[PDB]
Write a protein that binds this DNA or RNA. Structure first.
Ligand SMILES: [Mg+2]
Ligand SMILES: [Mg+2]
Ligand SMILES: [Mg+2]
Ligand SMILES: [Mg+2]
Ligand SMILES: [Mg+2]
Ligand SMILES: [Mg+2]
Ligand SMILES: [Mg+2]
Ligand SMILES: [Mg+2]
Ligand SMILES: [Mg+2]
Ligand SMILES: [Mg+2]
Ligand SMILES: [Mg+2]
Ligand SMILES: [Mg+2]
Ligand SMILES: [Mg+2]
Ligand SMILES: [Mg+2]
Ligand SMILES: [Mg+2]
Ligand SMILES: [Mg+2]
Ligand SMILES: [Mg+2]
Ligand SMILES: [Mg+2]
Ligand SMILES: [Mg+2]
Ligand SMILES: [Mg+2]
Ligand SMILES: [Mg+2]
Ligand SMILES: [Mg+2]
Ligand SMILES: [Mg+2]
Ligand SMILES: [Mg+2]
Ligand SMILES: [Mg+2]
Ligand SMILES: [Mg+2]
Ligand SMILES: [Mg+2]
Ligand SMILES: [Mg+2]
Ligand SMILES: [Mg+2]
Ligand SMILES: [Mg+2]
Ligand SMILES: [Mg+2]
Ligand SMILES: [Mg+2]
Ligand SMILES: [Mg+2]
Lengths: 262, 206, 152
RNA sequence: AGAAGACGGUCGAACUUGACUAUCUAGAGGAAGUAAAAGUCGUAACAAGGUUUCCGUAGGUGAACCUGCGGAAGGAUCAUU
RNA sequence: CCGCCGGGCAGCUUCCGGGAAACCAAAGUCUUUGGGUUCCGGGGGGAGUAUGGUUGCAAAGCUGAAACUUAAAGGAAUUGAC
RNA sequence: AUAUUAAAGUUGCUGCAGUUAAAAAGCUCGUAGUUGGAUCUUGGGAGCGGGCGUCCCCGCCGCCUCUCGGCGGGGCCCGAAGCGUUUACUUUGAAAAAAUUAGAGUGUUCAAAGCAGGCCCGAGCCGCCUGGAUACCGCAGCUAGGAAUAAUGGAAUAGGACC
RNA sequence: UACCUGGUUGAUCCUGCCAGUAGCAUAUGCUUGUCUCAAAGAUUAAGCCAUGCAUGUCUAAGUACGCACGGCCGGUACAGUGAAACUGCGAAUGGCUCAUUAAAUCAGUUAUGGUUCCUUUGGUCGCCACUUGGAUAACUGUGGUAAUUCUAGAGCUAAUACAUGCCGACGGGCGCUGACCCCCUUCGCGGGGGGGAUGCGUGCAUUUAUCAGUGGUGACUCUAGAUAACCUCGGGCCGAUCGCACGCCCCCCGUGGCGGCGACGACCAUUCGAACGUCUGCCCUAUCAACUUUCGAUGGUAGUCGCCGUGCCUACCAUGGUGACCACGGGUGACGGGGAAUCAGGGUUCGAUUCCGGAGAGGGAGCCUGAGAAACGGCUACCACAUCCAAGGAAGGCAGCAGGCGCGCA
RNA sequence: CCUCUGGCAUGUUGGAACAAUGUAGGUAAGGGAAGUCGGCAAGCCGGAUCCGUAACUUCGGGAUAAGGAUUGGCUCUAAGGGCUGGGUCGGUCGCGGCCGGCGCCUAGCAGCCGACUUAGAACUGGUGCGGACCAGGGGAAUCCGACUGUUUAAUUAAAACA
């Protein structure tokens, strides 16, 4: 590589895009954006695979440029704009409005929400700052330098953001006994209260998560993004509920749904 | 061209490293500033990511600071006197970081005399008669004299420095890296250091 | 003298050694104000660093250099470089055809700060990784046990 | 503002010359190995093979070989009062 | 003279058990395979040759190939023939 | 025809040989290497659970700390700390590109493949139900439990604790 | 499926090999109806290349006076399409090949508290201004050369190109300075308390120094703040900027206020990354045993350069550093890995080749542009090959896709 | 090679010319041993410093092998040595002594002297610099004699004698 890389091979593409083999060489490749390529859903895929609205990239292009689509409600004309975790996608003319939230398998579920609720989002803080002249800042995971926060929102905590105004509107401090969804690794999509956080100096920090239905499991803090004040969540969750079933329990639940219900 | 990189020298063991690539514009050097003393001359360089490196080439003014006193006027860089790396830089008179230059005393002098209200650099009665009396002459009384009396056994500057001024340059060390910054800012040798570099210079003179 | 054995004066950066004008002799009792820090991860920044007057930029306590990354134990084999030693880290590499092992040593070079006086060879040493500070060196010495048999 | 030009430096192709190194090949004559063969000279070895063979080592011999010294049994004596 | 004890040199003895066997109380405790560890062989020839190194006064020693060739060469035991 | 794998326990860790078939250095010393005897908390005690008593199974006897923090005097026991004397080992957790591979689901007409399909429905529903799993991923690095084995420390011209 | 058979002998049992047997690639022979997939100039020659193609690009929104088209409207420049040209962006990806390269590449792991980052997203962005200077292209016209994606002179004429540079702003606010003035006490010097014109500074970024200890971390010489100065001076910077669509409201008539995009910039975060570092791991090879070092070997101190940490480089010191746990060298029919073929369990072999990383563009060197190149479908050199020449000169790079020659079993 | 002390009058004559032949010195375009019995003769080489040195070998050598580089002038830097000195505070006796107590440079510092080298740098010239002088040409082979030594005073130095 002489300079930056611009293409993305289909296959080099991430798995959670459900992009198939025989269709092209390439995958889209997101744009530089508010999410890490590896952890996005390029609006193209979102539209003409998951929402099947378009058929090709062209049909995606045409939808995008009646200026319908509205990622965290601000109108985007890129197909490769990476719409990622806890953005919105107000599609407006149809009036569905989504969120993208990790399904238990971990693939950015299609998750419709009510316009009231699609007002607000939820953001993990990556840092506190103090810039010049003693103004303090935040930084959301997804880039939003807020400025002048509550001197209270510390690291790894979350913020419910208004969208229209921006500006932090009410916030939840990462502690034990606090709802969360994991945004990485194997336990991506799963949900529970916390229970335990282990500090290890330097070497980064584990956090166990006790699911509602017993299953304790763990992860590194990095991936834990909170969504509640213990049990009660500050958003809609997609059905599946961030539970995660054993392959056999899953097989049963399919087998019960088949034959009987109809 | 003139490159900086590990690949081209031997290892810990002393084997010969083979090169797998060729030179890379970033594994890269440029020929040196070795800025001399003289009238201002700076050429800016483009570096990685754009940006600038202002290679000094001649220089005269420098923003030196009398540390103790907390004044820092910008002053003539009068000569290079000593340099720890290599005696040749001193002989060529080349300004680089951690040099020991000389800088005009004058702006520090002036400020001592306007702040502390005493003189600096001893003399019979040419400086004392006209200017310092005019600097003094307390038409106010009460407040200003009380302030300058509060500047008590406190003005009490060092012996080496008082000597330097009465000569009238300062030993000064350069803190900037002229070849990259453009400037040649520094600090005035004081106390234990000054005493050390004076002892170094005397020895060199023999 | 004593400290300044070099061509340039050896001052610790950070601290200014010059503001003074009061009674009770010239300078204080301790005279200088020594800069040091603590280096973290649970390590006792020792007495001989803080008490002592020496000066080293490559001291992890009393000089600029962040410990950050891997932490490795070795054992000191030589001490013949100035302010630096070599430690031999030994380990049983696994070959899996023969479900066996092979011994293997890597005498890495290491920066020994002279907070540590009276360190000998055969002395277990725990180095902290840091920024490359010689061509070979990337590890400062942080704690030395020496208690392998031979005396207190 | 500023071109061409030039001192020096710097990287440094490239050439000229040695020096090492790896490989590949020519060669009068020499001296092997193998294989073909319906040759020549013997008869070393296997039966005590007609001088037990065999070892190590020396000298000699047209050739196999012989002899000297000290070994071996894998001998042609597990045994001789 | 008659025992016993340790440790040697061997000997005879047998369905210990092995082994292609002749044989071996070890050559046993091995497809029921692992006490420890060193040296070593990988069809027969070429060949312990050529070459390089090394040692030696020499004689020679230690290290040590290949090209080429070739279906056996070999061990043990049996019946014969001699 | 040639390379190459199995056959080949004819390269042998599993697993081969070395009296006579090919093979143990002429002998002994010897450093590196490899290998190294035995030895320290154990029965018991008390309960939940199973076939007045016996025989099998399951939480307990990480110690100390209060010199530290608090979920004008205190309790209560958690954050810190003498971190597990210091490893190996094991077990758990995390972290682990996809494709491949294994392997769920799914009549591509079968299959190799592929990742989808399937449904209600007279279509008036102007639709709906779903998949796109899981495993493995040496060695090294990281996390917690276990402490048999194997190494390794600690008091011997003396040293551990005490308003 | 955890398999064996033929061959030394007159027969026998062994040791042993040869030979068969079954997979997989490459080639080839002979054959071949149908359908679905699908490898394919790697092995030899990273040998050579005829010809064509493979990187260009315009919206409402950067410059249109071609007149090349055309309006509907004039005369208040501009109306609407628009070749060309200047400007901006891109050409650093993709594609190809596997020559080199053996702790190198590369894989896992870790650092960046040691640096850069076009863009993307989010922050910040208090007397020419009713808007300045001159220049140049296309265009028009003179031309020169045998000849090139050669250009020279003469006319003009644009800007978001290139330059230049103002109103705001509160004789006010806060730091110093302080003409002086006032009140209390005192025998009085003095002591305490107040006020205060006139001056300098009147900071985001940069450079240096000093002082203190809002927010952070296992971890600061961090972030933020105070003081002093400096400006990396026009070639520090934002300071203070150009385009498009609709078109409104004034205790008020001719002025002054206004939403909605576009483009732009300095600093910060953001992403894409990049870049160097940490720990462990690679085939044969001793007919390779010592190797490295004043021409950096391995340390140290000060610098230099570099985006930054480091012998990266220079200077002065010290004498280090690796090695039988195989260094050093040599070889490789060696790009690394994911993987592939074989397989009971163990293994063996292969991996030029569709993903990831790396390298290179006939060979070597240097460099401009630019955020990113030491780019080769960019230059400048030499060498090697080659092409026209009017002999003075000029142009070249298939290991892109096709294609050819050459090499070969391919 | 040039000079001072000291010594001399150019070695048994002078003058004028400057032809050939000579004797002794030089130089030579291009070629470079073709010359000749034969490279005879002359020519190259040469000093020092820094590298770098083969076959072969009696392991001593071969060796200055071979083969390369540098050298002037000037202006600097760095490195190499000697000597002497504190018994200071208190007491007392005559700047000097004697006693007692500190100090005790015990990492030494201070002043004062003195040869001479060597290494590095900058500038500098019409690339010239061991500027004269002095001063090895190399290599591959064979024959002989080991070697060093000796030998025919007046033709033989050799492989002869030792
Ligand atoms: Mg590419
Ligand atoms: Mg195994
Ligand atoms: Mg016949
Ligand atoms: Mg045996
Ligand atoms: Mg066995
Ligand atoms: Mg053989
Ligand atoms: Mg095989
Ligand atoms: Mg097998
Ligand atoms: Mg065998
Ligand atoms: Mg035999
Ligand atoms: Mg034998
Ligand atoms: Mg033996
Ligand atoms: Mg034991
Ligand atoms: Mg037969
Ligand atoms: Mg076979
Ligand atoms: Mg980044
Ligand atoms: Mg090769
Ligand atoms: Mg390249
Ligand atoms: Mg080519
Ligand atoms: Mg290039
Ligand atoms: Mg090309
Ligand atoms: Mg004469
Ligand atoms: Mg005469
Ligand atoms: Mg005479
Ligand atoms: Mg001539
Ligand atoms: Mg001739
Ligand atoms: Mg002739
Ligand atoms: Mg001659
Ligand atoms: Mg010679
Ligand atoms: Mg002869
Ligand atoms: Mg002689
Ligand atoms: Mg004679
Ligand atoms: Mg003679």
């Amino acid at each position: 590589a002489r300079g930056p890389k611009k293409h993305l091979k289909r296959v080099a593409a991430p798995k959670h895009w459900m992009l198939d083999k025989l269709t092209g060489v390439f995958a889209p490749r997101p744009s530089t954006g508010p999410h890490k390529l590896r952890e996005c859903l390029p609006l193209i895929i979102f539209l003409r695979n998951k929402l099947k609205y378009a058929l090709t990239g062209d049909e995606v292009k045409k939808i995008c440029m009646q200026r319908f689509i509205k990622i965290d409600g601000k109108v985007r004309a890129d197909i490769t704009y990476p719409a990622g975790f806890m953005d919105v996608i107000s599609i407006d003319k149809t009036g569905e409005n989504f969120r993208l939230i990790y399904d238990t398998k971990g693939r950015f579920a299609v998750h419709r929400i009510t316009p009231e609720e699609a007002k607000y989002k939820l953001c993990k803080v990556r840092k506190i700052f103090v810039g010049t002249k003693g103004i303090p800042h935040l930084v959301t995971h997804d880039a939003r330098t807020i400025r002048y926060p509550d001197p209270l929102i510390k690291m790894n905590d979350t913020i419910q953001i208004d969208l229209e105004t921006g500006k932090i509107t009410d916030f939840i401090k990462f502690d034990t006994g606090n709802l969360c969804m994991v945004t990485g690794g194997a336990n991506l999509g799963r949900i529970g209260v916390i229970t335990n956080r282990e500090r290890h100096p330097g070497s980064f920090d584990v956090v166990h998560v006790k699911d509602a239905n017993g299953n304790s499991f763990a992860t590194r803090l990095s991936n834990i993004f909170v969504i509640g004040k213990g049990n009660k969540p500050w958003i809609s969750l997609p059905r599946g509920k961030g539970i995660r079933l054993t392959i056999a329990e899953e097989r049963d639940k399919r087998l019960a749904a088949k034959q009987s219900s109809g | 061209g003139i490159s900086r990189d590990n690949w081209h020298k031997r290892r810990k063991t002393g084997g010969k490293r083979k090169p797998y690539h060729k030179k890379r514009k970033y594994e890269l050097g440029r020929p040196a500033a070795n800025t001399k003393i003289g009238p201002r001359r700076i050429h800016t360089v483009r570096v990685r990511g754009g940006n600038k490196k202002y290679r000094a080439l001649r220089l005269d003014v420098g923003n030196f600071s009398w540390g103790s006193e907390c004044c820092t006027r910008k002053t003539r860089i009068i000569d290079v006197v000593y340099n720890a790396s290599n005696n040749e830089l001193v002989r060529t008179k080349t300004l680089v970081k951690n040099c020991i230059v000389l800088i005009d005393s004058t702006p520090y002098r002036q400020w001592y005399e306007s702040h502390y209200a005493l003189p600096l650099g001893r003399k019979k009665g040419a400086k004392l008669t006209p200017e310092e009396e005019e600097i003094l002459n307390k038409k106010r009384s009460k407040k200003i004299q009380k302030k300058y009396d509060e500047r008590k056994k406190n003005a009490k500057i060092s012996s080496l420095l008082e000597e330097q001024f009465q000569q009238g340059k300062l030993l000064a060390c350069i803190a900037s890296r002229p070849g990259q910054c453009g400037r040649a800012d520094g600090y005035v040798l004081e106390g234990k250091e000054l005493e050390f570099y004076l002892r170094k210079i005397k020895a060199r003179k023999g | 003298a004593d400290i300044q054995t070099e061509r340039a004066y050896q001052k610790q950066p950070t601290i200014f050694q010059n503001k003074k004008r009061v009674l009770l002799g010239e300078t204080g009792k301790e005279k200088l104000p020594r800069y040091y820090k603590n280096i973290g991860l649970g390590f006792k920044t020792p007495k001989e660093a803080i008490e002592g007057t020496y000066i080293d930029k490559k001291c992890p306590f009393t000089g600029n250099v962040s410990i950050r990354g891997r932490i490795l134990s070795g054992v000191v084999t030589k001490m013949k470089m100035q302010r630096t030693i070599v430690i031999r880290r030994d380990y049983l590499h696994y070959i899996r055809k023969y479900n066996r092992f092979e011994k293997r040593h890597k005498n890495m070079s290491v920066h020994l700060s002279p907070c540590f006086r009276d360190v000998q060879i055969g002395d277990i040493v725990t180095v902290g990784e840091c920024r490359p500070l010689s061509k070979t060196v990337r590890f400062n010495v942080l704690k030395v046990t020496k208690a392998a048999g031979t005396k207190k």
